[PDB]
């Protein structure tokens, strides 16, 4: 499939060097000394019917968007030209590891020393340090986030699933795999997944694939509320009721009422939203943990040069030269279509999605309104803030509260069954 | 150019010319099974004093030799072995025979590999009268050398979808041997176990075995 | 020494005995192998000084052919027995020990 491994170092719109202050690792490392912090990433998530919020971090949004910038700065050392390890501070930072592992205070010595200088834009192969170039197994376990991070920072924009539906994710093992979790939270299921490739990230053509496929897929489409109660994917749709606010629960089931017919033909997309709120979310950051393994064990396509900013394209591991453009919405006329093409069918009364979509944009409101504050008092500590530099979350602007430009692709998206 | 302790080229001297491989069939395999009286497969080689044979190189497919010498069997002269050669060749010429006729066809594809496990066992004087039809390749040998799940796990062994062996026999010293000057090493690949392959028709699914594999 | 792993600094009717013995030793000594075990996802690893899921075996391994006991002779073991017992018979065809 995909023996070519690459990545990219972050780019800023205006920073002379890496944002990250110690703090933040400390406060992360409290524990341990990994780069990837997925346990209680997964798990700060407070079961997702809610948030975990802090000063520090709100946001899971602000959590991995530190945890990018973290990172960024982390790899700026041992991979050069003059590839190394040890004695050279990156903020008082040294790895302890030939494997480049371990995290600890820089030496005496070491404190004193200035740290690594950074750049732009640094795009890298994944492949060069021979150390891990010889382990294959925990190449391809820190690829899946090499990736995590690489798209959600390829674009001026938020994360994007890799849609796909096809015939062949039917068959006996795989219905006997989905028998596993009915009546089953998707975040439950999501929390496994995480789990059986974080052991081993399963191979190419794996029957976990077509099934992380039917995960995504019927996900999105009880998103956009595409199936349903009648309209059926092989009978089988989650459910959230508490439409409206900020977090849902979509869960299995099955009807016995109405069955839709999946047609021949393969199709597939790339979907993103146009709204910075998503932070509230978590169900993208999950799609993105299992989307980087599908890459890391099967080779995936790629997307038009032109559907990238122009200094990000061409990219071997990522950039090809064609591949479906984007995908973007935001979630307050995202449920408006959604509830509105569902009372189109007709399983509904117009007072329903009327009083639905009331609460909903309140809440868009009020939390667009805490976001904008929460700029404005970072806004105030950078100015109070010459060296201890940092951005909660990547910036954004008020230019994105509008279209989601989503019209059209209402039908584009429909008509994949 | 001078290297550590050697003294090479400064300039070239490598062509790129190369030609088109052999493909093998029912008449190949009996020719084969000829020992043409001036067309022999083999080289029988020699010290270089007084150049007396002491030794031979194979041309696969002859090969498949796997096991000890102690059952081998064969004389110290040089001409006695080819006549005891001949003989037991012959025989098993009237044997093939025997399970396929000399016209029952003309030409056809078999898995060579399968010819040398057949040589081992002959030679072997152990019986194989049992792997017969296994000889003729359908399409591909691989599906068809992977079939099989218990048979004989002393020339062949089949794990998955992998057959792994080691490669037939190329070398041979004999027994007027003594390490002159001029005796030039086979590199013990005469030995009944000096190594060790494995296919099965690509890379990538092994590469994906090797995490459990040395 | 050297000469432990080198049969060549002794003339071999000097004595014979020890320069077939080293030599024997050379090219028979049994042969290892090994063999995979369990299940990674309900026992994991601790191998460590190996490649994961491997298990060695100083013994080389031979599959059976047939699901009822098997009649064999030509074991590495059996030959090696075979092989001492040998050893044994050429040492006592010494002329010395018939006075």
Request: charged fraction near 25%; proline fraction near 3%.
């Given at each position: 499939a995909r023996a070519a491994f690459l990545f990219k170092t972050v780019g800023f719109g205006g920073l002379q060097n890496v944002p990250i202050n110690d703090e933040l690792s400390s406060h992360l490392l409290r524990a341990g000394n990994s780069p990837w912090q997925l346990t209680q990433f997964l798990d700060w998530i407070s079961l997702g019917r809610g948030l975990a919020t802090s000063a520090l971090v709100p946001t899971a949004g602000s959590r991995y968007y530190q945890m990018s910038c973290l990172l960024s700065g982390t790899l700026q050392i041992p991979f050069r030209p003059?590839?190394?390890?040890?004695?050279?501070?990156?903020?008082?930072?040294?790895?302890?590891?030939?494997?480049?592992?371990?995290?600890v205070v820089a030496p005496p010595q070491v404190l004193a020393q200035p740290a690594l200088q950074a750049q732009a834009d640094r795009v890298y192969d994944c492949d060069d340090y021979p150390f891990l170039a010889r382990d294959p197994r925990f190449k391809h376990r820190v690829y899946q986030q090499l990736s995590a991070v690489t798209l959600l920072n390829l674009t001026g924009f938020g994360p994007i699933s890799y849609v796909r539906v096809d015939e062949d994710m039917w068959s006996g093992d795989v219905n006997q795999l989905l028998m596993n979790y009915f009546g089953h939270t998707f975040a439950e299921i999501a929390y496994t997944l995480c789990?059986?490739?974080?052991?081993?990230?399963?191979?190419?053509?794996?029957?976990?694939?077509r099934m992380t496929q039917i995960i995504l897929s019927l996900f999105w489409l009880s998103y956009v509320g595409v199936i349903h109660?009648?309209?059926?994917?092989?009978?089988?749709?989650?459910?959230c009721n508490r439409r409206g606010d900020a977090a849902e629960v979509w869960i299995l089931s099955c009807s016995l009422n109405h069955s839709a017919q999946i047609r021949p033909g393969n199709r597939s997309l790339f979907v993103m939203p146009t709204s910075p709120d998503w932070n509230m979310d978590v169900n993208l950051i999950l799609s993105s943990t299992l989307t980087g393994c599908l890459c890391s064990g099967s080779q995936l396509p790629l997307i038009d040069n032109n559907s990238v900013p122009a200094v990000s394209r061409n990219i071997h591991g990522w950039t090809g030269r064609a591949g479906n453009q984007l995908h973007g919405f935001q979630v307050r006329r995202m449920v408006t279509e959604f509830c509105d093409r569902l009372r189109r069918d007709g399983v509904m009364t117009q007072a329903?999605?009327?009083?639905?979509?009331?609460?909903?944009?309140?809440?868009?409101?009020?939390?667009?309104?805490?976001?904008?504050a929460w700029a404005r008092e970072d806004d105030q500590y950078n100015q109070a803030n010459p060296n201890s530099t940092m951005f909660r979350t990547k910036p954004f602007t008020n230019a994105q509260w509008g279209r989601g430009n989503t019209g059209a692709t209402s039908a584009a998206i429909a008509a994949l069954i | 150019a001078n290297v550590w302790g050697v003294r090479l080229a400064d300039s070239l001297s490598s062509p790129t010319i190369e030609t088109r491989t052999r493909q093998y069939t029912l008449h190949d395999l009996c020719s084969d099974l000829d020992a043409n009286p001036g067309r022999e497969p083999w080289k029988p080689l020699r010290n270089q004093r007084t150049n007396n044979i002491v030794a031979v190189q194979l041309f696969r497919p002859l090969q498949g030799l796997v096991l000890d010498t102690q059952l081998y069997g064969f004389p110290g002269a040089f001409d006695d072995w080819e006549r005891?050669?001949?003989?037991?060749?012959?025989?098993?010429?009237?044997?093939?025979?025997?399970?396929?006729?000399?016209?029952?066809?003309?030409?056809?594809?078999?898995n060579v590999f399968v010819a040398n496990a057949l040589v081992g066992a002959f030679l072997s004087n152990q019986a194989f009268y049992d792997l017969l039809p296994l000889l003729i390749i359908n399409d591909t040998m691989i599906g068809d050398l992977l079939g099989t799940g218990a048979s004989l796990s002393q020339f062949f062994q089949s794990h998955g979808d992998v057959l792994e062996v080691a490669a037939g026999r190329k070398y041979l010293q004999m027994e007027n041997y003594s390490n002159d000057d001029d005796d030039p090493p086979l590199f013990a690949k005469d030995l009944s176990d000096y190594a060790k392959a494995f296919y099965s028709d690509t890379y990538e699914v092994l590469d994906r075995f090797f995490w459990t594999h040395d | 020494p050297r000469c432990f792993m080198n049969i060549q600094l002794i003339s071999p009717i000097d004595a014979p005995i020890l320069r077939q013995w080293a030599e024997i030793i050379h090219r028979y000594w049994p042969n290892p192998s090994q063999i995979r075990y369990g299940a990674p996802n309900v026992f994991g690893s601790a191998n460590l000084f190996t490649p994961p899921e491997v298990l060695l075996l100083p013994i080389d391994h031979q599959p059976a052919n047939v699901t009822t006991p098997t009649l064999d002779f030509t074991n590495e073991l059996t030959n090696w027995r075979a092989r001492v017992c040998e050893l044994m018979k050429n040492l006592v065809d010494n002329q010395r020990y018939q006075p």
């Open positions: 003059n590839h190394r390890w040890g004695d050279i501070r990156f903020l008082r930072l040294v790895w302890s590891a030939p494997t480049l592992d371990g995290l789990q059986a490739s974080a052991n081993r990230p399963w191979e190419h053509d794996g029957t976990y694939a109660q009648q309209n059926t994917y092989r009978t089988f749709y989650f459910q329903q999605q009327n009083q639905i979509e009331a609460l909903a944009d309140q809440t868009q409101q009020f939390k667009r309104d805490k976001l904008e | 005891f050669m001949r003989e037991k060749l012959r025989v098993l010429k009237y044997e093939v025979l025997r399970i396929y006729p000399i016209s029952n066809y003309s030409n056809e594809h078999v | -």
